[PDB]
């Protein structure tokens, strides 16, 4: 199925994300009939994520949307999105400033950092239609 990981860092905020809502709304509207994929997403302040990476591997520096891609040997035809790590203060501010439902900002902001970071658009043979339709159903299917 289409499993996604929504890991919030704050317990009390001005607009909690909750996986049920986010996942269901976005990821739920993408595979209402056929589901299959894995998208890990960690939403926490800059310091946490940055330190988190640099503490266990030494990743980049104070970025905006850092994600962790899976093993990219050659082509490997299989549904996947990999791990993701983004800040809420930024996206929440962007979405909050845009004056639009954070629901879309999430599905969009996640995919924005998912591809722009690794490019899960692997092999255009199988993963193509799957991935394409995958991102298309959540991004276009709703028309953010």
From Swiss-Prot:
One of its GO terms (molecular function) is zinc ion binding. Binds 1 zinc ion. Coiled coil: none annotated. Its cofactor is Zn(2+). Its EC number is 3.1.-.-. GO terms for cellular component: cytoplasm. It is found in: Cytoplasm. InterPro entries: MetalPrtase_cat_dom_sf_prd, YbeY, YbeY_CS. Single strand-specific metallo-endoribonuclease involved in late-stage 70S ribosome quality control and in maturation of the 3' terminus of the 16S rRNA. This is Endoribonuclease YbeY.
């Amino acid at each position: 199925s289409v499993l996604v990981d929504l890991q919030i860092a704050t317990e009390n905020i001005e607009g909690l994300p909750t996986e049920e809502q986010i996942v269901q709304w976005a990821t739920g509207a993408v595979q209402p009939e056929g589901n299959e994929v894995e998208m890990t997403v960690r939403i926490v302040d800059e310091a946490e994520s940055h330190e988190l990476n640099l503490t266990y591997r030494g990743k980049d520096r104070p970025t905006n949307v850092l994600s962790f891609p899976f093993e990219c040997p050659d082509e490997v035809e299989l549904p996947l999105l990999g791990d993701l790590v983004i800040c809420r203060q930024v996206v929440e501010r962007e979405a909050s400033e845009q004056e639009k439902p954070l629901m879309a900002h999430w599905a969009h902001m996640v995919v924005h950092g998912s591809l722009h970071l690794l490019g899960y658009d692997h092999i255009e043979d199988d993963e193509a239609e799957e991935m394409e339709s995958l991102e298309t159903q959540i991004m276009q299917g709703l028309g953010f």
